[PDB]
Design a protein. Structure first.
Ligand code: HEM
Ligand code: HEM
Ligand SMILES: Cc1cc(N)nc2cc(-c3ccc(OCc4cocn4)c(CN)c3)ccc12
Ligand SMILES: Cc1cc(N)nc2cc(-c3ccc(OCc4cocn4)c(CN)c3)ccc12
Ligand SMILES: Cc1cc(N)nc2cc(-c3ccc(OCc4cocn4)c(CN)c3)ccc12
Ligand SMILES: Cc1cc(N)nc2cc(-c3ccc(OCc4cocn4)c(CN)c3)ccc12
Ligand SMILES: [Zn+2]
Lengths: 413, 416
């Protein structure tokens, strides 16, 4: 049955037919909704499971290019059946690889940035065999995507999983991240989100400069071997010093962030195939930049410190001192990136774009999967147009999936 | 489903195990292939039959006698047999006063969208099942207002009018809240007063109300008893406690002329206990600051309160990325908390409320086996990620007794 979604601000009502085409489960049941669980519940598939999934993807592909049932389509289906038959797997044509990767982004229910979905630069790295080659492919990705600040969406796709013992993995969660150091007293130098990975890198031989914004080395695993450390040429890492248009002391917080958000620990699934290394990158929404959790000193947060320098009453919560210092930190982030002509988007324009994207998707595609819990920005939610937009969340393939951290699965040698 | 379900707090890494979800009763709207958690709502003659009512009554009576540690007792088995005989010979049954009180507290305890549930057991229940006329509803509602308000030291309360029978004799409060401000659509397309209430204001005017046509005209009560046509009553203005909105730093903020009422009192919802339907059950607590909807008022023509506040703050409003909207919204929310506290009217900020709810949710998982929660509604409309509920995973499921939506009465009422 069709389903309606209403916008309660504009009273616009959209009809979803696209959800009838999903068959990956969401994790909810008729009796329990799990829409706020982050991962709501071995990975190597047999030929038996493979061809259905491959056939489904070849079918929607040849339907995307208005040739469903053509000689080309009939033949491509036979070609893939033969290849699954003899090799227990198959290889995507370049066109399929590009179409499938764009559509994984299009189907990412949690991504507010999807209006750009079809402008994606796809780098085919399926010939890669070693970590040195990964490092070369990733430097090219970084250099292309960054583009002296005029950022450009890209993805680099390394060879697909075979038996599971030969995975390609980028052990970093992002290509560019800052190191976090657990301290003597107990606090944290650098980015606290990365303390575990930082200790893994030190244990692997990395010599930490032990600063606040130490770019972490790339830790790269090719064909299931042990991972190897590589330093990204510093000239490829574009950074933005964070300053404030009104507060001239903000620059004295010593803060900066990197320009390129490039997520490197997810799994790309296309037509039954699993690409366990597929770093993809776009540009930031201002609210993502997690500099607020840095420690200015040995006791006070970037929130606490900013509100301190703003001379706010921090004795009680009802003064909303956290809320004021949050807005100012985000003003500073957007002002700084814009002053350096580094691509960034504010959460107002981003959510506005996404509503317009939803309209497009319901017109041409009969729906758009969307995860309200993740689409709604992490501040000022109800004054953005997504807050009052009803959304239907469902799981379409090709897709980006979660996968275990490699240091929990890997048998060293 | 499996027996255990785990939720994770990603800020603290605490994991909680939920077994209460196995007692969930009705559908959520979601399926295994689609999630409807952001959908707001996933004949009058149709009431529960004998065959439908029996198991629902039994389920509730069992749950009640279990709660008072008398399950399987003589008194439990006798109450069961008495209910079964009322249903058999009258097609319905009457709750005991104890059962009504327990039912109402647990509809609140089970309200997955309420951040305020840490208070659920401290709820004054007013039994109004002897009411027969709209004048008597007015009496009961005036005493609810006066009790709940308590000169600014607000106390949560619910007043429960007779249950539904054949669906042709419903009691209804036509107001959406006991206290709301009138909104008047103008011939030029602008709005005076509160635009959220334009439709109901027009119903009141059509029902004979003479409006003052001001910014903050308290609407009249529109009260239907026993399925009769509703009738209009003015709340005595001395019962409506109000707070002028001023700002601790901005002297000019008082010049906006804003005020709001103290007592949030929702009156269009349906209370379901043991299969019985109480279509009129106004209930009230106190506000979280972010609720107070003064920001949508028009200061002048095309400028609402957000725009006007940003104008008086001299913020650049030419581009969104200056975050002028965000900045103005914080100051509005500061003034609202400052005003209620200065006048000693009960109010809670979103930081305190969500912190209390996390404490409450952990206790419920501990002592009840779970706590249904609707993240989409629990997380506040501003500064979500810096409140403790943003990073908290939740399970949403529908337990009974419950508060439910019902269609507006003007859509279904047969006029006499
Ligand atoms: C082009 C500009 C883009 C913007 C502004 C953007 C914005 C966002 C934001 C704000 C989130 C949520 C982040 C959070 O809450 O922590 C998100 C999630 C996501 N983005 Fe986008 N994004 C962009 C591009 C892309 C691209 C190019 C891809 C892949 C081809 C992509 C794939 C995803 C995925 C898969 C998620 C979900 C992660 C998950 O399921 O855990 N995004 N995006
Ligand atoms: C004691 C102070 C209370 C506070 C601070 C509070 C807070 C809230 C808030 C902020 C919401 C969501 C509002 C929105 O998103 O627009 C809500 C929803 C709700 N509250 Fe509470 N509440 C309180 C008392 C009560 C009481 C006494 C009852 C019933 C006995 C109740 C029942 C509900 C219900 C049923 C909903 C959801 C309504 C719906 O689904 O449309 N609340 N509450
Ligand atoms: C291409 C891209 C651009 C952008 N501008 N933003 C992005 C954000 C994510 C993203 C967000 C949250 C995620 O979930 C874990 C998490 C850690 O911290 C907060 N969430 C994951 C999973 N790797 C990815 C992924 C891709 C992004
Ligand atoms: C329900 C929900 C919605 C949403 N839209 N997003 C979420 C993001 C997280 C999440 C989990 C881990 C994270 O990372 C570690 C951490 C940060 O702060 C405390 N722990 C972060 C941010 N990094 C976010 C958790 C839940 C989320
Ligand atoms: C006792 C109580 C206290 C309080 N402090 N707050 C409350 C808020 C609601 C509430 C919130 C949203 C609702 O519905 C969606 C909506 C319409 O407009 C804005 N939200 C409804 C249904 N009447 C009730 C209900 C009860 C509340
Ligand atoms: C997905 C969602 C989550 C949430 N947590 N809450 C919501 C609140 C509304 C809603 C509906 C009607 C309303 O009433 C009239 C209106 C004003 O602005 C737009 N509609 C209001 C606010 N009064 C809010 C709609 C959706 C909501
Ligand atoms: Zn769901």
């Amino acid at each position: 049955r069709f389903l309606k979604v209403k916008n309660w601000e504009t009273e616009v009502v959209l009809t979803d037919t696209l959800h009838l085409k999903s068959t990956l489960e969401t994790g909810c049941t008729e009796y329990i909704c799990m829409g706020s669980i982050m991962h709501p519940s071995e990975d190597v598939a047999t030929k038996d499971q493979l061809f259905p999934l491959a056939k489904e993807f070849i079918d929607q592909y040849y339907s995307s290019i208005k040739r469903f049932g053509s000689k080309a389509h009939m033949e491509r289906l036979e070609e893939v059946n033969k290849e699954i038959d003899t090799t227990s797997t198959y290889q995507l044509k370049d066109t399929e690889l590009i179409y499938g990767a764009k559509h994984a982004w299009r189907n990412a229910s949690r991504c507010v940035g999807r209006i750009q979905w079809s402008k994606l630069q796809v780098f085919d790295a399926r010939d890669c065999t070693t970590a040195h080659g990964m490092f070369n492919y990733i430097c090219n990705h970084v250099k292309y995507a960054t583009n002296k600040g005029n950022l450009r969406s890209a993805i680099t796709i390394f060879p697909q999983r075979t038996d599971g013992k030969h995975d390609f993995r980028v052990w970093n969660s992002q290509l560019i991240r800052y190191a976090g150091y657990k301290q003597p007293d107990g606090s944290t130098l650098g980015d606290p989100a990365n303390v575990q990975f930082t200790e893994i890198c030190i244990q692997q031989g990395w010599k930490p400069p032990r600063g606040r914004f130490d770019v972490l080395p790339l830790l790269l695993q090719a064909n299931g071997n042990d991972p190897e450390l590589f330093q990204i040429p510093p000239e490829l890492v574009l950074e933005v010093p964070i300053r404030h248009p009104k507060f001239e002391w903000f620059k004295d917080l010593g803060l900066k962030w990197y320009g390129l958000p490039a997520v490197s620990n997810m799994l790309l699934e296309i037509g039954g195939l699993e690409f366990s290394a597929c770093p993809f990158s776009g540009w930031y929404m201002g609210t993502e930049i997690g500099v607020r959790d840095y420690c200015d000193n040995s006791r006070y947060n970037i929130l606490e410190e900013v509100a301190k320098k703003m001379n706010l009453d921090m004795r009680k919560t009802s003064s909303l001192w956290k809320d004021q210092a949050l807005v100012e930190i985000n003003i500073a982030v957007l002002y700084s990136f814009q002053s350096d002509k580094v691509t960034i988007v504010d959460h107002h324009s981003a959510t506005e774009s996404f509503i317009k994207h939803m309209e497009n998707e319901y017109r041409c595609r009969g729906g758009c999967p969307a995860d309200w819990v993740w689409i709604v920005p992490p501040m000022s939610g109800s004054i953005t147009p997504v807050f009052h937009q009803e959304m239907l969340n469902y799981r379409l393939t090709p897709s980006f999936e979660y996968q275990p951290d490699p240091w929990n699965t890997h048998v060293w040698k």
